[PDB]
Amino acid sequence: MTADLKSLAKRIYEAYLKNFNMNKVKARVILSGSNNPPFVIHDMETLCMAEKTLVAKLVANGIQNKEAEVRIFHCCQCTSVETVTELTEFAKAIPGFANLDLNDQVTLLKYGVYEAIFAMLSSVMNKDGMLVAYGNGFITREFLKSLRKPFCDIMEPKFDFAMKFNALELDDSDISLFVAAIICCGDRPGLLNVGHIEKMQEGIVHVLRLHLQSNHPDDIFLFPKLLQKMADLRQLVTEHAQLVQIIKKTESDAALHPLLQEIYRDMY
Ligand SMILES: CC[C@@H](Oc1cccc(CN(CCCOc2ccc(OC)cc2)c2nc3ccccc3o2)c1)C(=O)O
């Protein structure tokens, strides 16, 4: 009569497979190289071609269309909004999460979503670029670096994180538990029921530790490596939020979707 941690790990993995449109298996199939192959965006010509096919409404305004960098900024936010919806549904599978007060659920998701986004973003990145638009585009790392400041500073730190994160060779069963652990941080600002959240965190981290022990017997330090990656993600989000605020304040055409402005409001 004890918790079945192996069953819980499988439940979390199944909830991740059901709730996230993108995962590492799907991304790798596309990145390896028959139907709906990804359009390569490596310069302004190919960006504009891709937009006309994949986000036609955004470029149907003629001389009124926004600057390319601002269009990219908007597209990035759209993915974040959708991923927040997926993360919110995923969180229901985490033991104890749905039993928390609604306000604590909101706070955990507020601080956790971008850490989870950047962790999962790594699955669609290689050293040369990243998948976009539900796997239907591939935008090169060099093209994103070529954008005018400060838009060229958005993605590069996330590539830097991803190259090292991907070198750990996690699979989706690992990532699902890592995302659940990200969401269950008992030290987020403003939590009410810290005690219950700490116990929820302890439980999911126990599931993660045992899973990594079983799934990665070759890497005895993988668990502390991932604890450090969680801290790295918190710093990456803090810096990202600062950049988003600079853009919002100084780029009169770069707007922030209201759901994301609420996430960012009073975060760091
Ligand atoms: C800028 C403010 C914005 O920052 C960022 C910064 C980095 C990443 C994101 C979200 N993101 C990139 C989507 C790009 O989406 C397009 C689509 C079309 C296009 O042109 C045709 C160009 C880019 C993404 N997260 C994922 C999670 C898992 C799997 C894949 C994922 O991808 C937002 C924020 O803070 O929300």
Swiss-Prot record:
Indeglitazar binds at residues 80, 114, 264. Disulfide bonds: none annotated. This is Peroxisome proliferator-activated receptor alpha. The chain holds residues 200 to 468 of 468 of the full protein. The lineage of its organism: Eukaryota, Metazoa, Chordata, Craniata, Vertebrata. GO terms for biological process: behavioral response to nicotine; cell differentiation; cellular response to fructose stimulus; cellular response to starvation; circadian regulation of gene expression; enamel mineralization; epidermis development; fatty acid metabolic process. Its main location: nucleus. The record marks 233 as: Essential for heterodimerization with RXRA. Changing residue 222 to R: No effect on heterodimerization with RXRA nor on DNA binding and transactivation activity.
